[PDB]
Symmetry: D2
């Protein structure tokens, strides 16, 4: 297998290819004057199985660039193309939340199904979206790498899921830290934050309103050191400043989405799925 | 048939639907906080044949937005979807100009072929790109509307094609103005600009280097009033200022690509192809 | 005086320089790889009084590009620089609408005051913002050019201001069309739309919610042909589609802000203010 | 003193305020529908001396946002405002490299001089640009934090400055690693890479052409483990992929400019300058 760097995951692709003990296939990427995307496989591709690693922070650009990379790889032989999209755009469009809406991830699933043979992503908004794929849909989990990152800096804490739906993440981290978990329902459904360190984990932190709320509250409940983590740190606008004011000790996310707090890497999570 | 407005051609769609004596189907379009595209068909769709009019100035956004609109229309019935993309992005990637390059328009042609039943565009960079489509590929011509726009403001001129490859456009306009045509090869292959009004037409004006050159020269040859026209006025950066300095009297383009000189509309050119 | 083209008003600058019977001073503009702005005065500047015409659709880019152009012009002699900013960004920040907010136009007024000797803009959100300038603050009005555009296509109509604060524009247009004016307060404070053509004018159409409302209502009141006009057609997202569905016959704006309906030019309005 | 977070340095501001044992002043930042910037100081400001930390990756946005934050802080009391701009945009425009060009950093220096009382930046392209400021112009150095980062992972290496002008950085790092330094002039002016680990440091890595070259060469000269570092990792386009192919073992930059390799923080470098 050869590893192809997408434009948006050049360092993750490198880390992955390093773990796989492979040389990174040089791939040229540029924008024409009008801004159109240009991809070209510089190195020679003997192997006929390629792995494309390109996250989708810039949703549309990533989608079109992937469509073009596939065309260039097929045209170079490669019988099997595996697409690694750490952050998969449009996954929040599970269903028709209103009449006339378009189920985005479904439409794109159809396209991915005709251009790549396998799709691997990290912590999708919803795993049921696999039903839309006529190809293998793999999803790894980074919560554990997050749990490990903070296990070092939290004195016997309690894991908390901002909302009941994030409970699974809380539990997972809970296991790796040997702590107790629970979720907010506003106050924790069971446990009490009084005088304890807290580790709040969720899959995404977008505007930061969900966490800001949990953080502010937990502090008012007498919690001590609090660290907020998430797989995809979208952190829009002043999200970070929002959490920092709320009192968090630190905010930490992975490199599935570039942010000022993408301290944890999913490189290994990806390698084990290949 | 119903006319669906893409986000990038809202006024052209209106003009077209007006000519077709149809009501414009209200279509909701917005961006989520993270910038993902959101489309929703607000009005009810009884008819089962829709026409999508969305040019691609923002190449990637237009492509993904089209992919989502189709998904929403199929999901609403509509057995036949005709996509009108006045300006078709990635059409300059005709072939592999180097080993390892991706034939962009080919890859996207494959996608258009699986999501729409027919594709109509105005003055593609190359018409041979139809070979890539497993569906009807129609291409109209706006040169005539351009010729008509200036016939009014040029005292017995001569039509000129910047390069030999733009000759066809020159001739076409030439016919509608009853003037003589020719092309630059640097000087006009035959005719002479001395003391005459000149109408230079080409399909695209990107950086403006091609025209700036023709204009500067023709002026040095004693040409009088010069008007530069093109179907797609990409006009990147200081392109316009470049031509104005060169001495053009006016620059005029159509509405297939929004610019400060999109004075001519292709609405009717489109209607006749439907 | 010499006319300097900003990057965002290249065609307006040309039209203005044409009316002033002057040659447009060639100005180079480009972006470095990292996207920083680069300006260079290509032609020689003997005259010591320059006029910069650069609207601010891309607010921040326009502000910094203006800051750099001034530096280049002073460095070339030019004792007096007049800045023409058809659309003046940040003008909606009149005052502190909340404790801790920044009065944007005030901060920028201070900057304009130290880099240009005179500022001319078309239809500011609020004219009181002149108090913030330690230099001459001129503001022209395009409503008349708008009134003239439609006088040709509306059978004895009535001018309407969407809100009481847009009354002034309604009246102005009212005068040039000899029709009666009035404003919505929801229904017209006096006149009745029943069986009449309507011309609704306002200074800005952003999301389109204000007009969409007026249009829908007036139609329900039995109005006939309706045309919506505005000086600055910001028309965000699906604004146009919104108005078209509401039933407007046409939407028309000026070239102070590039849109698909910038059919009217303020070139002359500007020339008379110089 | 209070620490104000700019939108582009929210995490660095937090780290700095943490080191300063101060609470981060909550600052609201958002974009209106048309994209204009909106800033509001949410918390109360008793102290009359503020420190603004906002790097300029998005050059123009950062400049205007700073102009607005100052206006809001003065309006809140604050007699002294210190601006920390880790990465200072437009610093490469030292002088007029051509007739008619604008000395960008000079024009902006004038503005910074009238809105802030002190300016602190990390590793400017040129320090002579201080001549343009009528206020205190401080510049810290991150090379040492970079040297420290790699001292841990390089077996007795040699520090190399890509070009003679980056020599100073090489020497600095050289001191902290006790290794020998030198520069490329193509080959190293003195030392030889044969069988040795190499640490190449420069202030900026933009397109990556400078380093890619050094790396490729040094490898051809038999160098072993090579690590490339820089203060500002602009890393445009495929820059990283370019270096990785060239053979670098790792690329590392600071958080003055967000990138996928901003592993080293300048928080402390900044704190010591306050
Ligand atoms: N990229 C996005 N950002 C924010 N909201 C989204 C996005 N994509 C879809 N949505 C909406 O988010 C809501 C998600 O509901 P849920 O999955 O239950 O959290 C629906 O109203 C979706 O239309
Ligand atoms: N969007 C674009 N802008 C500029 N050049 C392009 C674009 N798409 C492709 N090209 C290149 O333009 C050249 C076109 O050659 P031709 O079609 O003969 O004019 C080839 O080197 C293409 O790779
Ligand atoms: N560019 C903008 N777009 C939308 N709203 C804005 C903009 N600039 C300021 N505002 C806000 O618009 C409101 C305008 O009130 P008014 O001037 O009475 O219409 C205040 O809450 C301002 O903060
Ligand atoms: N942001 C930038 N990116 C790339 N080049 C720039 C930038 N700003 C200025 N320049 C140009 O870079 C060259 C720098 O020369 P030097 O400072 O000797 O490396 C001059 O021709 C400048 O006009
Ligand atoms: O179930 C979990 C929710 O989807 C996330 O908590 C939510 O998407 C995060 O959004 P925000 O940070 O803007 O509150
Ligand atoms: O054959 C015609 C050429 O393709 C066009 O003249 C060319 O694409 C226009 O480009 P520019 O205005 O940047 O010179
Ligand atoms: O007084 C007039 C109002 O300021 C305008 O009607 C308003 O700003 C237009 O905004 P929108 O088109 O988003 O409703
Ligand atoms: O003196 C040092 C040079 O300014 C830098 O080496 C240069 O600016 C880096 O540019 P690039 O990575 O695009 O070669």
């Amino acid at each position: 297998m050869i590893v192809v760097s997408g434009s948006q995951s050049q360092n993750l692709a490198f880390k992955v290819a390093k773990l796989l003990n492979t040389k990174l296939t040089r791939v040229e990427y540029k924008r024409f004057p009008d801004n159109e995307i240009y991809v070209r496989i510089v190195d020679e591709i003997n192997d006929d199985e390629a792995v494309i690693i390109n996250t989708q922070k810039n949703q549309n650009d990533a989608i079109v660039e992937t469509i073009l990379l596939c065309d260039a790889l097929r045209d170079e032989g490669v019988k099997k193309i595996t697409l690694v999209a750490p952050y998969l755009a449009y996954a929040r469009q599970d269903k028709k939340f209103n009449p006339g809406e378009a189920i985005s991830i479904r439409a794109l699933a159809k396209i991915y199904s005709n251009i790549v043979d396998k799709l691997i992503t990290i912590n999708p908004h919803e795993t049921h979206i696999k039903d839309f794929f006529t190809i293998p849909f793999i999803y790894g989990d980074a919560v554990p790498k997050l749990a490990e990152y903070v296990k070092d800096k939290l004195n016997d804490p309690i894991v908390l899921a901002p909302d009941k739906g994030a409970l699974e993440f809380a539990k997972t981290a809970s296991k790796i830290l040997n702590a107790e978990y629970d979720y907010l329902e506003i106050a924790p459904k069971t446990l009490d934050a009084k005088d304890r360190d807290v580790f709040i984990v969720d899959d995404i932190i977008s505007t930061g309103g969900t966490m800001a709320t949990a953080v502010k509250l937990l502090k008012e409940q007498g919690a001590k050191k609090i660290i907020a983590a998430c797989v995809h740190p979208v952190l829009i606008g002043d999200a970070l400043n929002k959490l920092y004011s709320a009192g968090v000790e630190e905010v930490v996310g992975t490199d599935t989405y570039l942010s000022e707090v993408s301290k944890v890497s999913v490189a290994e999570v990806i390698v084990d799925l290949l």
